Design a protein around this ligand. Sequence first.
Ligand code: NA
Length: 129
Amino acid sequence: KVFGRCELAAAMKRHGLDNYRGYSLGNWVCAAKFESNFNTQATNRNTDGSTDYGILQINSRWWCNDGRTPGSRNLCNIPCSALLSSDITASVNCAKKIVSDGNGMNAWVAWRNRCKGTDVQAWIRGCRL
Ligand code: NA
């Protein structure tokens, strides 16, 4: 599913990402834009042989099982394919566990490089939220 910006903002807010671990909603919308272009079916292979999945490009080294990442973990206790659904529940639940790590949203390289320090609330402007 390719979300609209306000559509994704509303879904992320409903699922409780607004101000989760102190990150305002626009941070999550910006992260999803630059990680996946708001496409839940996005996948990208990493150099280490792990893969990133879904609207927040969650990685198979630590967070999900894709059955092809040797010596990896599955801390979200999900198949990586769960992160490609039109239903973003599994991606949000897993993003909450990621951002609760001490690195916060710096786990998302696209957030660090294209959202952090910018006016991220621009990503929710115009939306009825
Ligand atoms: Na894994």
